[PDB]
Point group: D3
Chain length 231, copies 6
């Protein structure tokens, strides 16, 4: 497959999907035994290893719907991937979404035209796989990790002048990132299972940033929750 330089079998049934290919290294290195690096195409590194005896691959996706859509397609069609779990951050758009919370996206809103191109007059609401969602929820509660479950907002432009996230915040949307709608939709189309799990990098509407220590912490939590989300 054009964008992933892996051979058949090198990629696990389950893949974690950080936006950052260097967080794809750090994860694979700091959490998995017997790492391999299957892809180095474009510097978007993929790694396969084991956690508790089991195969888990970790692939970087890049930023924005088009980028992740490329990898999520090839991972599914070309390497028959069964479980896809994005693990990244997001800006929070509500006061009551706290900097230590870990977000599991049930659904995602978007201003990307990726869906409107496919459907036309229908607002297509993507959907996380409820099994993968439940398992992550349980896995978080069992260990006592704080967790918020609601919707998110997949943006096309990081620096939006015509920013309606003020209106979306009023409707309950928890925060904004730039991939989930893609993951959830492509997974659903091909009959696979997806889930986004997201930490809070900052509050967008109060400007307030989170300290690097808090990020390290909840970043670690996310990955733990991730790693138990299967079965």
């Amino acid at each position: 497959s054009v964008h992933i330089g892996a051979e058949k079998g090198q990629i696990a049934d389950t893949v974690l999907l950080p936006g950052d290919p260097l967080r794809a290294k750090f994860i694979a290195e700091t959490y998995l035994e017997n790492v391999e690096c299957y892809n180095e195409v474009r510097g978007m590194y993929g790694f396969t290893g084991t956690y508790k005896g089991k195969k888990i691959s970790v692939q970087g996706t890049g930023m924005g719907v088009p980028s992740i859509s490329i990898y999520v397609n090839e991972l599914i069609q070309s390497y028959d991937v069964q479980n896809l779990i994005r693990v990244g951050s997001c800006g929070a758009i509500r006061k009551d979404v706290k900097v230590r919370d870990v977000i599991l996206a049930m659904t995602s809103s978007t201003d990307s035209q990726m869906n409107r191109v496919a459907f036309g007059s229908v607002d297509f609401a993507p959907c996380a796989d409820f099994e993968l969602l439940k398992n992550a929820y349980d896995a978080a509660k069992d260990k006592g990790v704080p967790v918020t479950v609601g919707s998110v907002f997949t943006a096309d432009q990081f620096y939006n002048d015509d920013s309606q996230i003020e209106k979306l915040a009023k409707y309950g949307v928890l925060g904004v990132e730039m991939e989930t709608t893609a993951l959830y939709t492509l997974a659903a189309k091909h009959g696979r299972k997806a889930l986004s799990i997201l930490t809070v990098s900052d509050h967008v509407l109060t400007g307030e940033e989170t300290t690097a220590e808090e990020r390290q912490t909840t970043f670690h939590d996310m990955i733990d929750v991730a790693l138990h989300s299967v079965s």
Copy 2:
């Protein structure tokens, strides 16, 4: 409030929302102790009673987004309703959604312009309250009732010539009804909790109808699951 002829306090914190005002009778009569009929405006009957000592109201909504939007607004603004649970049927659009399954909608797709009018360029994906969703899920599993959790499709036209539910079925959508997007959105806007729970009246794509006995059964299950969905 214009459409509901109730006095302050007559309506419970929790309201069930069947489309059919005569199923609003049957429910209230066959399941609740000490029924009252607060509303008879338009023949869209509302009833308040108790189940296991606790107050539970039951209000008919009518068919289509505009109708339910009227009642869900007044119920929230005028009578401070905290929990809104739709209980109705839907046509299934997949072979693997079985006639005995009970559907809990995480999210809803729509061709209603209700959201596009409010947002413009954003596909707004509505969202069930995860607490009410979990509780219903648990309540179903505890008693062994079969349950599917995924997305649905809120249509504007019952008899759609330009029917894209063929394309939606391919993306995983479980079935089609005509209210949920409204409920979920209005609930979320005003900071309340909503959930749709739906039985399967028939398969739309195989034409195949379900026998009246199967309907009676899963209708009963739905209402039981409903009644435990709180706390």
Copy 3:
């Protein structure tokens, strides 16, 4: 037919269509000789009777485009109805539309996506049948009843935050209701004849309500005009 529990022949060639199923009773009872009640499905009552020897049916439609679309379809396809006349109220959006005026809608604007789904890039302007329109006009003038003839606005949401009826008022639109675009379109598609006749329940833009006595009066006028609108 699924939503109407009538047998072949029980429904007249001509049907009046009040939104309110209890106004469907009141009309049939207070104006027709030898009433029957053919439908009690959902409590959306239909009645057939005679006025001046002639058959006239009266069917409740419910609120919003989706609801009336259901009944108007089945009435046409399943019971070959030739003449469909909605008789309901509307909120006025202009100072010069007076509380005693009776409105005959030539056409209707809408924010419902029902048409855009069918057409795409075309603004489809629905159209009253000019014969039924003329006859009602004549019938009003012959008896001296005040009558305004222009366009209306079929809304999807009764409580619209993004309310552009301020802009529509400037373009001449007389008032807002929630059914006509549906009636006019479905009638036209299947080669039948439709017309909306509407009283003014209140002014939306001046808040000002109309007294119950004025409503009783113009309600009665509407129904008289209706009853002469044929031939």
Copy 4:
């Protein structure tokens, strides 16, 4: 005013609006006493004269919504024109619209974005002035001229590849031209009175053309009907 080279008062309260500036000559010359030519800007001739003692101006508009919109604006704002009556032809899109019929447009559908730019999510249905419409109707019947009253279709492209007039024909639309939506909308916005009256140049869907003699005849009828449409 930029596009009309007339002085205050030279233009009548009532103006006829043929698309063709040379049909603007022929009309003024063959039907009016004491003709003047107020405008020669762009060769889009305007003429003022009398018919039965009364002032009637005749202005060419050009082809398409943008063109007529220019003239209809200046005629209204700059010369306070009260009555605007388009008189042109159209291609018929139904078998039952006959070549001798004379069409009075109640309303117009369009694929022009002129309205969507102003409104956004609302399908704005333009509307003929019912007084001018009635008078023309009466004036036709009094003299026995055959007349069809329904909707039309204002196109942007004369040679449309993506032609949906096949779908519009099924919904009752009588024929296609390229101005009416503009006239009706601008008239309504500024509180003036408009009406389109149209002959049938040909059938578009059967290819069949009309003979030049039939055109001369119904062209003459149109203008007679026009000339009585006032008071």
Copy 5:
């Protein structure tokens, strides 16, 4: 062809396209040897003549996308025209576009739905033929004529209330006219070559008009540049 009353061969491979049929006279008369007038249909005059021994036709188009689209279609399909060069004016929307500048449009923005009807979800950006563009550029520089090369804005309404040319000015768009998107698109579809060359009639955003003498001058320049744009 319906709108052009010319016989085969009377129209040149190259045609200039002024909006104004009387500027179509003035050009043909003041610049070409051995003029003919092939078309007088609608008073939209076409002329064929020679400049430096070579055939050059000059056809008036009228105002707005629909009008020019009619002529540009027939000129191409019916008379196999190879080179189409619009020569008209525009209102400038930037301070740095000077009244003496001559504008060559690389591309055009539009609120016309002509493209969205053909494409749907795709913003189609029209495109000038780079050969005709270069030649005009060279021809201007060789003689020292000041020239700006960028984008323009094809409007549907001359008098736009919802005028976003304030936002377009910020994105670099040089000025507004009402034809180019049509020319460029139809030329490209049928594999022909087009270019718009435009003088500045006024600044729209500073209200400031240009004196008639400046217009005469740059009008003349435009036509000279035009006449060298071939080969």
Copy 6:
């Protein structure tokens, strides 16, 4: 700035923008004297060096509109970049676009909603800076390199099922890539200069791939043309 880990001054006035951060290395290494690596954030490497004494930076952008939009914003706002030149490949959609041709995009079509979000009813046609465009054109012809100048298509989805590039090919569009509309628009908004220069990786519509040797060749040409495009 969040995504670029460079200090003030480390980035040149002119930046080349390959999609591939490893082609950003190869370029900087194989063509520039005294390379520095200012950014290693996300592995999207930026390099500053000299070519013929002059500073030229080279920054990787990633795939898709959202990705390049991030870098093009920060490069402009945070490091005052004056000249931005994308250098990447594209799939060709016409037979007459040859595998050795080098494409200079005048404009770009798109199905990205990035523009429709900002404008609404306006198709915004982006625009290359004509100076940078001319210079590249000259630089190609002076050395005899084959060059095609026309429009392109910025897609959101690499694997488009609803692929209208069949219709776009008919309108003259030369090929499809996933960045240009972003570059051209953001450059224009902030008053900077942009240009895309693209090689042909393959023909999409004939499936036919290009041999690796041909890619090496035209890749080299592109970069040479790039390097002369200034002044």
